[PDB]
Amino acid sequence: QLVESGGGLVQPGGSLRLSCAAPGSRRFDYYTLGWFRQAPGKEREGVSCISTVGGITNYADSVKGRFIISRDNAKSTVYLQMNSLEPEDTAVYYCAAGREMCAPMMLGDYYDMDYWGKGTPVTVSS
Amino acid sequence: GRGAAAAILSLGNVLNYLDRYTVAGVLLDIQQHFGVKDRGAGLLQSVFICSFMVAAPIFGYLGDRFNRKVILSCGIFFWSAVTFSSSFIPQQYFWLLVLSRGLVGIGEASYSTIAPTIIGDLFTKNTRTLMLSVFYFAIPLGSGLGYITGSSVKQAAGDWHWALRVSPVLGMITGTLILILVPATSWLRDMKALIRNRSYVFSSLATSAVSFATGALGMWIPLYLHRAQVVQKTAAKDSLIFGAITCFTGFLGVVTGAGATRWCRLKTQRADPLVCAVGMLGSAIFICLIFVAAKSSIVGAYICIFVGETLLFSNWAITADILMYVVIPTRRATAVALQSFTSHLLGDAGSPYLIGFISDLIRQSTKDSPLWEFLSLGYALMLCPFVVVLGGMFFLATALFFVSDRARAEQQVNQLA
Amino acid sequence: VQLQESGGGLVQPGGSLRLSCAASGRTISRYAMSWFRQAPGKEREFVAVARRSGDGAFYADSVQGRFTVSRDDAKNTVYLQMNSLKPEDTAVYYCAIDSDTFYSGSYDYWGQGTQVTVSS
Amino acid sequence: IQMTQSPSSLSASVGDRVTITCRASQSVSSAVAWYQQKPGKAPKLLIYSASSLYSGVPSRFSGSRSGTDFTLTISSLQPEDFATYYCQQSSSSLITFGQGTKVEIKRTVAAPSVFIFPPSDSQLKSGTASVVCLLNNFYPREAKVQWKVDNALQSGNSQESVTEQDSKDSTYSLSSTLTLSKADYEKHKVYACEVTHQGLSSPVTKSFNRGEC
Amino acid sequence: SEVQLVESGGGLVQPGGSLRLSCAASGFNFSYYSIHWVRQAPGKGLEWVAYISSSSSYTSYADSVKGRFTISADTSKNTAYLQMNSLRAEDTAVYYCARGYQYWQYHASWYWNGGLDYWGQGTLVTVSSASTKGPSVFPLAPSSKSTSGGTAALGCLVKDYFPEPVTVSWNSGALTSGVHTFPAVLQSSGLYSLSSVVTVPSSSLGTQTYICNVNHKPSNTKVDKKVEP
Ligand SMILES: CCCCCCCCCCc1ccc(-c2noc(CCCN)n2)cc1
């Protein structure tokens, strides 16, 4: 699998750093990354994704300008950096790897990914 | 009641493939009833594939402008009736059997191009794949049943005409039932970009090689093993064995290839072409040993057939995955159609005819005795290992540029909008 | 255990008063504390109740909005604040203890009462 | 394994401020979730993670923590907020619910009305007697009733039933029933209801003598 | 869409029997969320019974029902089953099925507790060893000493019936002032009873007539009675 770390309780205006890494000699270099999230009364939605060769990145509509994504294929790691969080971002964050290209109008589709994580919770109090 | 639509279309597919390989299982008899050499006994497959080739794109066109159920049923009735009616030709005329095969080609092409679309537009994301999977894995079963039923009916009934008269009854039955149990529901600028894609072109050539080998061997082995039995002073338990072997190697190879590529995808990003290449080269070694083991023992020839037959099919599940990895999502229909046509052209449209022609050219320059029948065919079928090795080298050539081509695709999709 | 009442006398119409009731010999921290009234020639009537610390207080219709209750645990002493007095309120007031934890209303310990007179 | 919820019945008028306390020592120790239920219907999630507000809830509810305690607060009661509230913790592979506190309407004290009803001849002829006592239109809810039979105290042969708060005056009513045989019924002459309530200066006894008419 | 959980399988069972409850879900992707069964007693508070996620390798039971309840799932139909064995009287309740979060075990901690999102509607499970009987009816007449300021009360008694519910009416529905009906109680044998009471001014004892009408549905039994001093 893929194993996630970070996550916790912050305050509005805070910041946080999540990581997802592959245990073993696995590589995931054929594709590694995209970050998803879910909240109680709603449905699972994609948050961002990063490509294979170039280093091209794509974000959802509500988080653009606040989140940042990065990939380190020298030691099997992916990082998400969350800045200026709000009460609306309380959720569970997941990490997933699939074969399709990195494009806008691809994020939302999650019933087609190969490997999934288990999730890490983020709570933003008042 | 959609389960009934799925099951009826699956039976239709098994029958579709059963009626391609019943001429092969009785090939030896055709020659003794019409008086033709090998070169004329290849035309029976060359013309079939020519007609199927040319008719598939058009029935793809006319299949979404107008109704569908009508076209499926018409295709089945046409090819079933022409098959049944073709077991009444008198001995003097040969061209009428060849024309028979052409018309059967038209009908089968229509059915096979249209049924997947219908069984696609009836299901959802989580089970579409399972329905298409069960529909497709009716290929080896039908192909084996061809040889099996041809041999068995000809053996019990004692007259080879009866091989061509038992399928069409099922044909009519299925054609009526597909009418009450089915619920009815800039390419010029593409080619200018598909032609500069090195991975795409090399993968297309290495599919052509696989079809060449499959077509030649699948029509010309049973006859060769018979001639082998005769020379060795030992003598229909030939086509029965070949059908039995193929009905299981077909599944075993596909499972093998899927499993190996799924383990190897996590060590590097050139998994698919390198798996395909290693499989092809191994198959070439084990094919080139039938034409050594067959002179002396038969069990050795059958073991060699098993191994080569298995490793040749391992790359059936994968070339789709190589296509969907270097071609952006709006140019995928053009690419699938173009590759399928080219696979058919430089492949088995003229493979069986070429083997027959070379065998006749060899035989005409020596004596004509059973020994030289056997040797002529053996020395003509030695092209299949050669072209299979070429196929292996074309997969290695694609594994060179796999990464650069994926990178260019990603830039294109993000650049569009 | 003993009890004493204090705070009666004369008052003008619309007047205000402050009364106390001190219980000695037994801690009243966990008990309910009640006050009654009785006019001359009339029967004893409910006036107000103060429950445990955190259970609020209750008053009858005829005395609502003008009377208030209060406790003091350290003093072991309760207080009744009196506002907007009228001649029909000229009567004797009495202080009593509800000893039950379940507020079933076990009045056994009573006081002596005091006379409050409204006149003009 | 259990939570403690206090206090177990709150009385408040419309427009007041209300706080409720859930206390525990289970293996979360800072995360509880709060639910609301109205009689007969399924419950509805109201707050999760001890501070966060579920989607579509009125914005007057709030929740917070203090040491090992957690508090829920309603700021300005409205007539659609009289219900029962629960807290949840999730220690382990288990989930344990709370005890719950009920929120109700306040008014002025009213002493109860007391009546007694003896068995009729139809009860007699079958040999089983059932005498009833009626309390009507009182507030608050806490009241005590006992049985006196020749000044003797009974037990384990009485049951009570009490309605919900009345929908017009916000008062209660209570029925108490005592069950005996006819054979024993012939062995007494005095039957008495002994009622005590906050609003009584003196205990109230109601009496019945056997067969008088 | 709109998410929807629907339960089925309620009813009667004699002691020692067994049942098979079925919660059927629609409107969401069944293999991303867990399913919890929660029960409420007749009068008491909520209590958690059991848990099953999708992969059928995560199941869990409370402390009070181990060895008797067994839960499992079916992803092709989107259905979850609870098999109930060795039922007793202690188990009468209303059962609810609610939706969870699929891993809440692994990420419940110091600060999360996600909670249960959507709830069903419930089925009633009744465990009894009685027989369908007919309620008996009795009067509650006023008296000269039952006058309270010119006001007296009267009522009717319904006794010894099974199962719930019954329906009551006064003068076929003419009078609905000062009418009270206390909830049904459970007798020591296993049968229900209750009573109904009204209050009227005393002079009405001279001219007005009051009739108690009772109706029991499964027995379709209507009984009418007339009260008098
Ligand atoms: C050493 C012996 C070597 C092996 C011999 C045994 C032969 C077995 C071949 C089985 C077979 C048949 C037909 C096709 C096929 N034809 O067309 C299409 C595409 C149409 C889409 N509209 N697929 C594929 C596979």
Author numbering:
A (entry chain N): 3 to 128
B (entry chain R): 100 to 284, 301 to 350, 360 to 541
C (entry chain K): 2 to 121
D (entry chain L): 4 to 216
E (entry chain H): 4 to 232
Could you share sentences copied from the article?
To overcome the difficulty of small-size membrane protein in cryo-electron microscopy (cryo-EM) structural solving, we developed a nanobody against SPNS2. Together with the NabFab10 and the anti-Fab Nb, we were able to solve SPNS2 in apo, S1P-bound, FTY720-P-bound, and inhibitor 16d-bound states at resolutions of 3.29 Å, 3.22 Å, 2.98 Å, and 3.18 Å, respectively, by the gold standard of FSC = 0.143. Unlike the substrates of SPNS2, which have a negatively charged phosphate group, the head of inhibitor 16d is positively charged. We found that the two positively charged residues R119 and H468 of SPNS2 sit above the positively charged head of 16d in the cryo-EM structure of 16d-bound SPNS2, likely prohibiting the inhibitor from climbing up to reach the polar “ladder” of the intracellular cavity. In addition, the imidazole ring right after the phenol ring in 16d makes it difficult to flip over the narrow gate region. These structural observations shed light on the inhibition mechanism of the first SPNS2 inhibitor. A superimposition of our 16d-bound SPNS2 with the reported 16d-bound SPNS2 shows that in our structures the hydrophobic chain inserts much deeper into the substrate binding cavity and the head of the inhibitor also adopts a different orientation. We conducted triplicated MD simulations on our 16d-bound SPNS2. The simulations show that the inhibitor 16d is quite stable in our SPNS2 structure.
Notably, a desirable concentration gradient of S1P which is achieved by S1P transporters, including spinster homolog 2 protein (SPNS2) and MFSD2B that transport S1P from the intracellular side to the extracellular side of cells, is essential for proper S1P signaling. SPNS2 and MFSD2B belong to the major facilitator superfamily (MFS), and specifically, SPNS2 belongs to the endosomal spinster subfamily. Furthermore, using proteoliposomes containing SPNS2, we showed that SPNS2 directly transports S1P, but not sphingosine. The cryo-EM structure of SPNS2 adopted an inward-facing conformation.
